[PDB]
Design a protein around this ligand. Structure first.
Ligand SMILES: OC[C@H]1O[C@@H](O)[C@H](O)[C@@H](O)[C@@H]1O[C@@H]1O[C@H](CO[C@H]2OC[C@@H](O)[C@H](O)[C@H]2O)[C@@H](O[C@@H]2O[C@H](CO[C@H]3OC[C@@H](O)[C@H](O)[C@H]3O)[C@@H](O[C@@H]3O[C@H](CO[C@H]4OC[C@@H](O)[C@H](O)[C@H]4O)[C@@H](O)[C@H](O)[C@H]3O)[C@H](O)[C@H]2O)[C@H](O)[C@H]1O
Ligand SMILES: [Ca+2]
Ligand SMILES: [Ca+2]
Ligand SMILES: [Ca+2]
Length: 349
């Protein structure tokens, strides 16, 4: 309902500021088809989302929210999305728009290693699912068409090959599948016209990873309009540091500087974002407000470094969950105020 005003991908990324992932929420899945909307949204222990949560982000120094959504349990046999589900995605988008935030809606655990994932970097799977994927994106794009440029679409989350190979696919043909999905995503959205003709769209690398082969074999889709694509990767590097490091040390820092240097060396004319980062490591062990103080400081230091490096590289970052989690969301209040304070200082000073 705010009037759409076309803005470049780099402008959006610059305007994201500090970002947050509303994780384990609309992306939660596994209870089966035909359940009430709230049964999905609270299935992994998060509260139902409220307007005040989005207001709280904006009023406390954040300017963007990523809204992961898993779709497969909400699609019928013909690939039609349940209307109550699409209306709830819309409602949460509206909370973010009302709060003056940027928002990203994606296709989340329809990819990767979970049961139910059906989008895979596998040429047979791509051929079997491409029309279903384009039909899903046609529906999302039409349902969300009228929101202004603060809303972005992200085609797919962490696409893996058929063996759920993290880091890189076992066969190079996997990249052909990923690159084809990415093109189909852009094509399907653009075809719906209107604001979607120029909306900023986000395309992710294989596994949302960032190694040399994954970047070298990544092909940005062709787009008939200029500067309206963003690349996304995820970084919880050095892998498992939360369990093995006492402090965010020079090895940790150098690991991140090398990652941003590589991404920036590759993407000299296209923006990229760090769509997830956090302390999550082996067995998804992560920081919480009852972690020892030194471990919370570890989390704070990671976050401060990530935010500042991303800013230096004209990128942007989205925290995965921990800072604003579970029961704290309904108050609303930060779960990890010292981590957030380190982020705010790094971003603003
Ligand atoms: O070789 C040692 C060391 O030498 C240095 O010189 C070098 O610089 C180091 O990079 C290297 O260490 C290893 O780094 C890799 C990742 O490196 C790539 O990305 C960072 C870049 O700087 C680098 O250039 C790139 O090459 C780490 O790889 C991690 O491995 C774990 C465990 O993987 C094993 O188990 C699963 C199986 O499928 C793998 O094939 C097998 O090796 C992976 O763990 C999985 O991660 C996902 C989440 O990943 C996503 O979120 C995190 C984000 O960083 C990532 O981009 C996303 O894809 C979880 O859901 C899975 O449950 C989990 O198993 C990591 O994803 C992967 O990065 C090595 O561990 C490290 O020793
Ligand atoms: Ca209230
Ligand atoms: Ca993850
Ligand atoms: Ca800047």
């Amino acid at each position: 309902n705010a009037t759409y005003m076309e803005e470049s991908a780099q402008s959006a990324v610059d305007n994201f500021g500090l970002g947050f992932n509303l994780g384990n929420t609309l992306d939660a899945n596994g209870c089966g088809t035909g359940k009430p909307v709230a049964t999905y949204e609270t299935f992994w222990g998060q509260p139902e989302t409220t307007q005040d949560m989005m207001t709280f982000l904006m009023q406390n120094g954040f300017n963007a929210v990523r809204i992961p959504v898993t779709w497969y349990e909400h699609m019928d046999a013909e690939g039609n999305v349940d209307e109550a589900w699409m209306m709830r995605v819309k409602a949460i988008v509206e909370y973010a728009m009302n709060a003056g935030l940027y928002a990203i809606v994606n296709v989340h655990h329809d990819t990767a290693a979970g049961s139910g994932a059906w989008i895979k970097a596998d040429t047979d799977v791509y051929a079997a699912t491409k029309e279903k994927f384009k039909k899903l994106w046609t529906q999302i794009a039409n349902a969300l068409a009228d929101y202004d440029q603060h809303l972005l679409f992200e085609g797919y989350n962490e696409m893996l090959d058929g063996n759920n190979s993290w880091d890189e696919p076992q066969k190079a043909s996997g990249y052909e599948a990923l690159n084809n999905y990415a093109q189909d995503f852009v094509d399907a959205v653009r075809a719906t016209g209107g604001n979607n003709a120029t909306r900023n769209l986000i395309v992710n690398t294989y596994a949302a990873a960032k190694g040399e082969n994954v970047l070298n074999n990544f092909m940005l889709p062709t787009d008939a309009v200029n500067n309206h694509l963003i690349v996304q990767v995820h970084s919880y590097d050095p892998w498992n540091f939360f369990n093995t490091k006492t402090t965010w040390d020079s090895e940790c820092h150098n690991t991140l500087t090398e990652i941003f240097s590589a991404l920036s060396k590759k993407f000299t004319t296209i923006p990229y974002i760090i769509g997830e980062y956090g302390t999550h490591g082996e067995s998804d062990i992560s920081v919480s407000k009852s972690s020892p103080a030194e471990k919370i400081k570890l989390a704070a230091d990671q976050a401060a470094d990530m935010v500042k490096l991303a800013k230096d590289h004209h990128s942007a970052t989205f925290y995965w969950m921990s800072i604003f989690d579970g029961s704290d969301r309904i108050q609303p209040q930060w779960s990890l105020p010292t981590v957030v304070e380190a982020m705010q200082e790094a971003y603003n000073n």
